[model samples]
Target: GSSISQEQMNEFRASFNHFDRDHSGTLGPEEFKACLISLGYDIGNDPQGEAEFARIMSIVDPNRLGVVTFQAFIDFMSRETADTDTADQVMASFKILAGDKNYITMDELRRELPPDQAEYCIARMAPYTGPDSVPGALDYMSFSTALYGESDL
Candidate 1:
């Protein structure tokens, strides 16, 4: 029931394809995890991460299927988009991708994201630079707002 914009929907499809390594049109657990990471989710490789992944599996793959379909992934994302656990999860990704820095520079994003994705993100972020931001640095707070819409941060 969550309404996502066309751009966001297309982006989600592209992101899903990026991690669907074998092009099976479905995401196995590992691919699903990587897909989530690229979407600003930081489910780490730990006991907690494992537990969290299991929880996600229950929601996204409720049929006990070993893989997640595009439909399922989109549904899960829509649910998350309507939810702040999202903000926290996205921020966790930001912190890690930015290497704990308050701002993320093009170079930092280039290192963590595909070249095209990095370029696309920066192109849309020019107007949100922080007051104290350097020439190429993007404040994560504004970044969050742009991507997820009004955030508490």
Candidate 2:
């Protein structure tokens, strides 16, 4: 009954598998965090005590198993994608990550993300080339759309 599409499901499965490198069918906390980042929702380097983080964990890991199952994850993501404002909310993340600049660069990502996560994002990010676009910078507009808009990547 969820509005999320089959294509989105495939994307989610791929993302989950990528981070679940051990094939354990569950994600450790760090892997869970990284998986979310790859899916366009960075929970930050240290999100402990954050409302959303705690809330998500409460649902996906209620028993404190320290690992999140794919079922729980897909369920959460299905609900999350259904939220109309989440796309706009993630757009705001571009502002937080970009700071004073209108665009985001690898340098900015590196400062906030783990080395691997930064690398992953840099590789996928589309470079901006306008007057304000500096070398190696990503256009936040296109980036956000690709991640959260109807384009389906």
Per-model RMSD to reference = 8.2, 11.0
The Cα error of candidate 1 at residue 146, in Å, is 15
Which pairs of residues have clashing backbones in candidate 1? Answer: none
Model 2 agreement with the true structure over 32-57: per-residue lDDT tens digits: 76667644452455545245765676
Which lDDT value does model 2 have at 86?
31
lDDT of 2: 0.59
Q: Estimate the TM-score of every prediction.
A: 0.48, 0.43
What pairs collide in candidate 2?
A: none
lDDT of 2 at 90: 45
| Predicted structure with the largest lDDT when compared to the true one | 1
Report the lDDT tens digits of candidate 1 across residue range 1-153: 224444455556666567897888777887788777645553566789878886786677756777777656765555443334434555456567776666778777655544344555555443444576566777654654455334457
